[PDB]
A paper describes a structure:
The synaptic vesicle glycoprotein 2A (SV2A), a member of the major facilitator superfamily (MFS), is a key target for antiseizure medications and a biomarker for synaptic density imaging. SV2A is expressed in nearly all neurons, and mass spectrometry studies show that it is one of the most abundant membrane proteins in synaptic vesicles, with 5–12 copies present in each vesicle, indicating a function relevant to neurotransmission. Although its endogenous substrate and transport function remain elusive, SV2A is a target for clinical antiseizure drugs such as levetiracetam and brivaracetam. The transmembrane core adopts the canonical MFS fold, consisting of 12 transmembrane (TM) helices organized into two six-helix bundles, referred to as the N-domain and C-domain, connected by an intracellular segment that forms a long helix (ICH3).
We replaced 140 residues from the predicted disordered N-terminus of SV2A with a maltose-binding protein (MBP) tag (SV2AEM). We tested the function of SV2AEM by measuring the competition between unlabeled compounds and 3H-UCB-J. SV2AEM exhibited binding responses to levetiracetam, UCB-J, and padsevonil comparable to those of wild-type SV2A, indicating that the construct modification does not impair drug binding. We reconstituted purified SV2AEM protein into saposin nanoparticles and formed complexes with an MBP-specific DARPin30 to further increase the particle size for cryo-EM. We determined the structure of SV2AEM in the absence of ligands at 2.8 Å resolution. The transmembrane core and three short intracellular helices (ICH0–2) were well resolved. In contrast, the luminal domain was discernible in the 2D classification and unsharpened map, but lacked high-resolution features, likely due to its intrinsic flexibility. A central cavity lies at the interface between the N- and C-domains and is exposed to the luminal side of the synaptic vesicle, indicating that SV2A adopts a lumen-open conformation in the apo state, consistent with previous reports. However, we were unable to observe interpretable density for UCB1244283 in our cryo-EM reconstructions, and SV2A exhibited an apo conformation. This suggests that the allosteric site is not well formed in the unliganded SV2A, leading to low affinity for UCB1244283; orthosteric ligand binding induces formation of the allosteric site, resulting in increased affinity.
Numbering used by the authors: 139 to 401, 415 to 482, 595 to 742
Amino acid sequence: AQRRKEREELAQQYEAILRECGHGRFQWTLYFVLGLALMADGVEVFVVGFVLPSAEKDMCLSDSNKGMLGLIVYLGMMVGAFLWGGLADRLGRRQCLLISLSVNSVFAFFSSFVQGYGTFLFCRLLSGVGIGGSIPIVFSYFSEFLAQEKRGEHLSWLCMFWMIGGVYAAAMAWAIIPHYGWSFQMGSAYQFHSWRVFVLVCAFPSVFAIGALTTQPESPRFFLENGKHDEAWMVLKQVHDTNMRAKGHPERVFSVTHIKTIHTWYQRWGVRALSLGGQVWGNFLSCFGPEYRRITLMMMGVWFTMSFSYYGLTVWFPDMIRHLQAVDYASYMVYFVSFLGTLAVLPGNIVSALLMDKIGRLRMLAGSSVMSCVSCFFLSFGNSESAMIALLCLFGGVSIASWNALDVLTVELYPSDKRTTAFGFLNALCKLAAVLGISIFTSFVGITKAAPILFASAALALGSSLALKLPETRGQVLQ
């Protein structure tokens, strides 16, 4: 009773304070700073897929090992998403993002030099664990600096760094891997081929992300929700002063005076760990309370269905391209095709960012899901590699709008004291669906071209149906 009233008052006052601060230099600097973390998350998905064909002959892989290297990144991202999303509600957004990026960068650096298959798999697993928490923490962290006026557009513009990271990965694979002449020996005991240089170069975005992130302040909403008034006041005054100084009005004074707020060594560390686990578990369970159970279940359905369909069909596409190429042949390309498939997403990002607030999150989500379903139904008519590439571009362009709308909706539908926990849980569910869909859609190749299409169409139709029952979030303060 009392706590809900106090949190609603805090939300209203925080909206008023952010409207006083305005949107300007500070928020765009933070946008570009967190774009580096999103870009690292984008690159991680492509690294192993690009390097596997060259690693198979250096580490002597069986096919099952290649598949397990295919699935390790998603497993690690699931675990890391849940872990870091849960922790970010207790330790803070900035600190947990720093720890996540540090783990990711360290183990990505290690994976470039380790020799055996098992150690490389372990290093990639831990790199995925590290970077798994980037999207839940980044989106909430950035949202906690945004007023409601253009919140949807500002959050939608954040999704374009993932595409930029995909482009970076494709370009660097194009530029580095083919050049086998770059290979050398790191001592006479070990040879060091170019794909390891590619693996190393894919770690730079996260290092730059750490460097840029160290300069930014912690989210003031976290401090206010944790009873730390003075720190939140200093952070908000920094925001206001930066915005006004950049706008040519340094004479303005931050008028806020008081903000509502809510309130042996190894043995001590054990107590700390148990208490942190208890609090994270409490947040996770409260995500399923009577106030949010329906929202949580509908979001689980939407996330799982669309992730499963998208990842399964995006793995199915290259397999069909290979099959048609082989059928024709029996009578740079990989990187270039990946680059085209990545650039096919840009129009979707632009349109979704420009229409998110004009037509709302629900219409975006449902219409994009419907278009994805019909573009899936179209895939039965493919007849050539160029046709399959074109349909892949169509599907990828139409689904990224669904993804952006889902991200914004997930940000807006949960309270600040559970936002990262819920986002991490749903993203781990997304990665679990990715694993399951990749496996199932891999099982179908060569046997039929109808079953995976029917699966994806049904899943996307179910997701579109669920997208219409979620509530509107425009015109509401950031709860």
